[PDB]
Design an enzyme around this catalytic site. Sequence first.
Site, short mmCIF file in Angstrom:
data_model
loop_
_atom_site.label_atom_id
_atom_site.label_comp_id
_atom_site.label_asym_id
_atom_site.label_seq_id
_atom_site.Cartn_x
_atom_site.Cartn_y
_atom_site.Cartn_z
N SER A 189 0.85 -1.19 0.00
CA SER A 189 0.00 0.00 0.00
C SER A 189 0.92 1.28 0.00
CB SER A 189 -1.00 -0.10 1.15
OG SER A 189 -2.13 0.72 0.87
N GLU A 193 -9.41 -5.09 -3.81
CA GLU A 193 -8.62 -4.05 -3.08
C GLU A 193 -9.45 -3.06 -2.29
OE1 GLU A 193 -5.62 -3.81 -2.39
OE2 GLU A 193 -4.31 -4.74 -4.09
N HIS A 207 -7.74 -5.70 0.40
CA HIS A 207 -6.54 -4.95 0.73
C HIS A 207 -5.92 -5.46 2.01
CE1 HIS A 207 -4.09 -1.52 -0.21
NE2 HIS A 207 -4.18 -1.00 1.03
#
Lengths: 524, 524, 524
Positions: free
Chosen positions: A200, A328, A440
């Site tokens: 990320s 995600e 995610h």
Amino acid sequence: SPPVVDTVHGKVLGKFVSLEGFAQPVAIFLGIPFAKPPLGPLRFTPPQPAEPWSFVKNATSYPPMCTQDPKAGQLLSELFTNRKENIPLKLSEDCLYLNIYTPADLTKKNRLPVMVWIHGGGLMVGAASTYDGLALAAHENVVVVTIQYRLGIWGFFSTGDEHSRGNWGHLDQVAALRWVQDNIASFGGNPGSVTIFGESAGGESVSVLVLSPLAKNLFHRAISESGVALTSVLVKKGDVKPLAEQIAITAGCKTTTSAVMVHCLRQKTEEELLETTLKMKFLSLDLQGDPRESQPLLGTVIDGMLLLKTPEELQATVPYMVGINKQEFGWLIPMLMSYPLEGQLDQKTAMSLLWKSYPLVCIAKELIPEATEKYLGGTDDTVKKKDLFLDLIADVMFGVPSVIVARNHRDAGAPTYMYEFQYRPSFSSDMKPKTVIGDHGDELFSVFGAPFLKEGASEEEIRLSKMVMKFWANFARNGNPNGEGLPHWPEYNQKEGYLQIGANTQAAQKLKDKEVAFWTNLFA
Amino acid sequence: SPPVVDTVHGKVLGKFVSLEGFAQPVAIFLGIPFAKPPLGPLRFTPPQPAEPWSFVKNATSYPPMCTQDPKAGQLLSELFTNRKENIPLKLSEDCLYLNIYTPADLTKKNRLPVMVWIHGGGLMVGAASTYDGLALAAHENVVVVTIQYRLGIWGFFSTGDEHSRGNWGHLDQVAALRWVQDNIASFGGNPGSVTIFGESAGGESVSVLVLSPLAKNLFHRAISESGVALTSVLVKKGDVKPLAEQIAITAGCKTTTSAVMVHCLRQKTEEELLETTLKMKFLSLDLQGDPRESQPLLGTVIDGMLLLKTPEELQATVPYMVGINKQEFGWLIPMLMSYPLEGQLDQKTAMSLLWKSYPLVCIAKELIPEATEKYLGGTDDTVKKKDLFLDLIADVMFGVPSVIVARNHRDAGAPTYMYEFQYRPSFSSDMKPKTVIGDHGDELFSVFGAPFLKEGASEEEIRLSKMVMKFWANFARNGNPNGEGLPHWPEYNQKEGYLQIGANTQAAQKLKDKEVAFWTNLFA
Amino acid sequence: SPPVVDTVHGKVLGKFVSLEGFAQPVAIFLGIPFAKPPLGPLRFTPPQPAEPWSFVKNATSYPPMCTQDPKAGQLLSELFTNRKENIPLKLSEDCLYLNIYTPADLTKKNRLPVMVWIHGGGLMVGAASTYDGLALAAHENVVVVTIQYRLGIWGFFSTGDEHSRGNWGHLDQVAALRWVQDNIASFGGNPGSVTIFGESAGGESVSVLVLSPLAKNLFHRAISESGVALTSVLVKKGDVKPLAEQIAITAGCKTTTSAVMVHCLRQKTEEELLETTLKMKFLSLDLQGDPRESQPLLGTVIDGMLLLKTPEELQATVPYMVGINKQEFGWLIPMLMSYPLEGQLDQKTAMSLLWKSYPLVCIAKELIPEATEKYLGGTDDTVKKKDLFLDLIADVMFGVPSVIVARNHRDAGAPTYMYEFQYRPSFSSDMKPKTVIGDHGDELFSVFGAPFLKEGASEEEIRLSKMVMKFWANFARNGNPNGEGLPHWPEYNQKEGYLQIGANTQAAQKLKDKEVAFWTNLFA
Ligand SMILES: *[C@@H]1O[C@H](CO)[C@@H](O)[C@H](O)[C@H]1NC(C)=O
Ligand SMILES: *[C@@H]1O[C@H](CO)[C@@H](O)[C@H](O)[C@H]1NC(C)=O
Ligand SMILES: *[C@@H]1O[C@H](CO)[C@@H](O)[C@H](O)[C@H]1NC(C)=O
């Protein structure tokens, strides 16, 4: 007796910890400084080297995490930690530390591949100590280094000029890699073989380091998990002055010149700056007014020292692994940002929501009905449309930029690999609905061997972690993840082969191909 | 017209003062800076060189004394000054000055022996200007230099690591000796012949300078009067972190890391730091709770720059004079520390008192009855037992460490001399009872020629000062105090000859011999 | 279930506690408010009535003690407490509380004699909760009330005029007695029968209440233990302005007018006022300068509301018991004030010490040699002279004023009793030498039944406490301490009979007779 290592700046003492199934303990060192604490006049300046010490420094307690919202920080740490119990951390401006997990034989000169982990948290929150390197170090025989870097105002305040260029937290990441080059050999690591990896904002940090002349030759392979620099919400281009002026006004400072804002912010206490952060309400989708004003966080700028031009301008060469997860935007991100969601969506609501999502996706109001219609127009079910809407944001923030980055890297002649991770870890939050798969952050539990540290993993989840660690480490050691007894992972060449990783691990081709054509055609 | 001297940093102007019996006046220079004022970010850092000046600097007014409790400071100054009237001084952080008394002929290039005086006051209080160098300079023909150095928090704050190593006041003493090496020749002094001398914390400072590689070759003889480094209350060994944390908490600072404490203390004003000092109640025997917590002052630490190992570890070579007074604990010290004393003592009270005196004498509770019984067990009289009890503390704080230091110095091959001073000056406080003889500080009036500056000295006291000044100066000039017309003072060799100085001046042997055997056997 | 009582302001809940030997438990109520907390604009104003409460108030935890030096406070509490373990208290400006110990039957309307205790501590330190009323309440069947009152600056700041008259802590004592008149019946106490008693500053407070028109009819008998108002160090006469100006300057306030000083002090926080207190160094014999400037504490003034004229002017009628201890200055006081004491004294040192003791004894310099010679001139032994010197201070501070007060009270026609207490409690500090007998405070352990609460009392000490409690309570109930099975205690009439209490309890005559003639003749 505990392990004691000599480093350029002085001796450090850590601790031996065992893992079931390995006869050698791992030596762990917590809270090693890699720079001078950035306090007082060092605020908003490049990191300085650490001062040396004359006697053994104890490296057996977790360091503070960089100043950040302590509730959002603690919450992200619990969600992402691969340990049995989350470790509560102190906040401080004095946070430029790294932690080392080395399975080497410290009497005998080893030179193990080094993997330097860069945490995520939107450049606003996060900590190194969330990530326990024990399982990866022991299973794969690599030195795991978790690093910290300045966050938020401390890390990214920029006046868009020479008085506060910005990117302090990235220069920190660079200084931690210099420290590794100079000192890792004493920990049994090969400084000739350093892989950077991060997730990320951490993946975006890897990507920026791949582009930056300041980081050239401080690492030899790179992995970005769910985040790259190109077109990111984390990259601020054009004129960044208006944000600096808001932060200074919120702090009670005059805005007469850049140098005046910087000097006045430099007089504020840690607490006053945390109060300013709190008043700006970062990391929350702002539902009021014109979405073009909303300012969701601080970030990378084009400062002229670390980055000379925009990622897009540079685009126009170490082995590089770029990956994304299947959903995600499935849960974790919309839930940390207070996304307004019934869990169903008609088309007009979808459009208003997308327009409100402007700071995340930057789609002009004229193009909203087209974009929405493209993702939602094939179906009746408002539950599905809601899924398809989450897909759209994910593709814009993560899937398209990652594939565009991988293609440019391939075309410049460097070795390139891609994956798409699709698994539901049993370590997911209890509030996370069953249908979310490859959210995610979901791949962190595999990469960091959470099935070897936490309870309850299925046999399949145990084998999934062993395989992912082995691909990651084979990539650290050779710049190619393949090896005996693993599914074949094709290099990302003109065929665009990539590995689907998870519930059924197999090679496939053309990740996000039709999405990249659509969005590219749309934006240009 | 007044004397004007050129120094490396610029010219300085002082004043001529006469003394009855000398036809040449002495040139006096007050308040010469030897370093940059340690303000603002210079707090808790090593002294920096003074900036040069372009025009004549006036050195005719006393400098401020270092920040300290102004009442305890003023009171110690009155008790110890050799002048007719005490000179009231201002407090300041800007206190790195020295004063010079030179009887040389400033037109004609003289090179007189230089004696650099280091004041006492427990490293907490004290001032240079208390000590008027006029009488010593004129009678013995030496350049007297009185120096200041940072005291208390400013001087000794230590986090036990590289962020605030400590010993700032000792580095100041070193920087004043560098200044002397570079500049004293213009004042008619021989930089090839510098003797350091000091009393109490000043004697402990001499001793630390004798041990320190930073001070090597900045002086050629040393005198410690009533205070050495070995086993002292003024030396803090092991982990000094808990004291730093208390000082920071008392000041309202967080204790999250060393660098955080130092930076926050660096933001406090002089007044806030003086208020913190006041709240810690240093220099007072704490009568409540567990005596092992009591913290009586700040002090020397093993910082790794000035001192590399503990005095005891180093122990395991300039001429050195080490002396003590007959009743080191007779009055002045117990009265400045509020020692609880009826003036008589039964054995059980004696034990409780000794246990309470732990921070001064460090005798484990299991050993208290033995120690007490050893000093008090030969007598019935609770008045005597009280005397014998004061003897015990004196021997532990001053008599034993001094003789152990002298023996180690002798055995390492360097010239060594000892004395025991026994005289009641007529300049004692009116509150000091008649029976106290050779109290802590009593020899200062002889060394500094108080009978030539103050009224009322007896013929014997006048002759005592002339003799002590002459021994001190013969030692400064030759590294051997002896000379024509003085009692013989034997070198401290295997016979342990020493000089009894005072009421009847004569050679004797084996100072504190049976005491050193007892305490050594007791502690090991 | 616990006892719950209705009071004018609302209900209060306490707790039942048993004492070995009594079949009825005592009901204990801690931390009952008797006034509005004196915060914010209420600082330096008369106490206001407490606001009522609508639901049961919990009175089961000790209240804060008034703001004061927390180390001196804690130390006095340990020295004087009659409990097994000292109870650590919090500091606060919100300290106007009292504690109640009632052995009554709370269902059945009892009306037991009420004894209201006023603690000592020089009007600077002290707390109610130090004194556990359990043993006195249970043995003698009386309601024991321990009260608090404002101390130090908060309690006694005076500009000598209408802007801050002073005596706030005494008005507090008066307001606690009004509370008793209005509410004690619900606790089984007879408001028609209230005895005030107190020690030292507490005895001086009783005495001031005996003189004050504001306290008329709020109590029916009075006991002063070691402290009265007449000629006291605790009474400030003439112009009190210079002290107010020093306190205001020390706090950083301008001194342009009284109202300006008061308003500015009213803006300071509790902490700033405690820092001011700390900087004034109260309760310490100042050894420097002219003893006529020394200012040892704040105190009672002649404010025109509580006291209209000086005690001496009024002098020119409830039963009243006035007592002193055999060695009032033997240990505790000189040791809390850092009196400079070798435990022996020649005459010249004695004189200098007496002159330094001016703020305690107020003897003009011209009269010092006479006074000293009178007490010390009969003996050779400097140990004795030291005792005789302690006697002199005790007689001036305590023995003479108490006997002068008792005689004036007798002559005005009211019942008067005196005692001299001479015993060494086994609960004395371990640092207190054996030879001190009947030190200041020694009678508290008897009065408060410490042999029934703490371990180790001798049979004689147990019987001594039973007897003293019974005399005290017989005096509370009848205004005459005598009763069946007690030694006879004569009324203090023209024969001046008094009771010697302690090691051998018997009637005697003419307490301090020759001392009163001497000092009276000396001062007039
Ligand atoms: C290092 O510090 C830890 C605190 O985490 C402590 O438990 C340990 O004793 C220290 N080790 C040494 C060798 O001082
Ligand atoms: C130096 O300063 C002093 C103050 O102590 C003053 O009296 C004198 O005039 C000054 N001398 C010169 C030459 O300016
Ligand atoms: C009263 O407060 C105390 C705290 O001292 C607590 O233990 C108790 O539960 C309270 N009682 C009631 C009845 O609420």
